[PDB]
Amino acid sequence: AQYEDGKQYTTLEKPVAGAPQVLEFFSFFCPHCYQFEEVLHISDNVKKKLPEGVKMTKYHVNFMGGDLGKDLTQAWAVAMALGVEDKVTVPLFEGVQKTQTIRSASDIRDVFINAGIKGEEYDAAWNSFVVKSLVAQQEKAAADVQLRGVPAMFVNGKYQLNPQGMDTSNMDVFVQQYADTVKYLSEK
């Protein structure tokens, strides 16, 4: 066929019931994730091709960057609760991977303050039980699908994107193939 299990995607032998429709995992320590975000705009291009009614979920993971990695997952929880993902995503990537000015929870916090979130509002979110369960959700969702690598995308808790099996000669062609695959998997 044109889309084949084991080529543009793999199928989970252990499907996950009740999973978000489009589920994406990343780490701010993850170099391909930086590319996916800053250079390729994968999330955005997938959205642009997704049907009517489909919601898109993105979670951070703990297994990179040890102690700071966990801080980053809680911070991404803060970002989701406050609805400020689009204002911190880029400076978080660049702070971890480009300038290397993020070395502590306090440095992560600075990124939010500079993005205009108020100190008191950030510290309140950081410490809130709503953020605790949002951290729990991120971990549970990664736990459910056996996740040992990022970037990763899962469709309807049963299919996993396999970007290794796509053209990387052209960056735009790669993205379109990737998104069209999400749309195909989505309609399955």
**Residue whose tokens read 């995992």:** 25
What whole-number distance in Å separates Cα of residue 7 and Cα of residue 161?
9
Class of residue 170 by CB neighbours under 10 A (exposed 0-12, middle 13-18, buried 19+): exposed
* Elucidated via: X-ray
Buried b (16+ CB within 10 A) or exposed e, 3-24: eeeeebbeeeeeebeebbbbbb
Nearest CA to 33 among 84, 94, 85?
A: 94
What range defines the domain where residue 22 resides? 1-188
Can you give the CATH number for the domain in which 183 is found? 3.40.30.10
Resolution in units of Å: 2.1
Amino acid identity for residue 23 in this structure: L
The β-bridge partners of 58 are 24
Q: Provide the 3-class DSSP secondary structure of residue 49.
A: helix
What are the two backbone dihedrals, phi and then psi, of residue 9, each rounded to the nearest 5 degrees?
-155, 165
- Helices 105-114 and 119-127 cross at an angle (nearest 10°) of 130
Instruction: Write out the E strands in 16-163.
Output: 22-26, 56-60, 152-155, 159-161
Q: Provide the 3-class DSSP secondary structure of residue 23.
A: strand
Amino acid identity for residue 2 in this structure: Q
Distances from the Cα of 102 to the Cαs of 69, 107, 108, 109, in angstroms? 11, 5, 6, 9
What order of strands is seen across the sheet that includes strand 56-60? 9-11, 159-161, 152-155, 22-26, 56-60
What are the two backbone dihedrals, phi and then psi, of residue 14, each rounded to the nearest 5 degrees?
-120, 90
Helices (H) and strands (E) in the chain, counts: 8, 5
Cβ-based neighbour number of residue 94 at 10 Å = 17
CA angle (58 as vertex; 149, 134 as ends), nearest 5: 105
Q: Kindly report whether the peptide bond that precedes residue 151 is cis, defined as omega within 30 degrees of 0.
A: yes
What whole-number distance in Å separates Cα of residue 123 and Cα of residue 11?
41
The number of folded domains in the chain is 1
- State the sign of the Cα–Cα–Cα–Cα dihedral 15, 20, 23, 29: negative
- What residues contact 120, with CB distance under 8 A and at least 6 apart? none
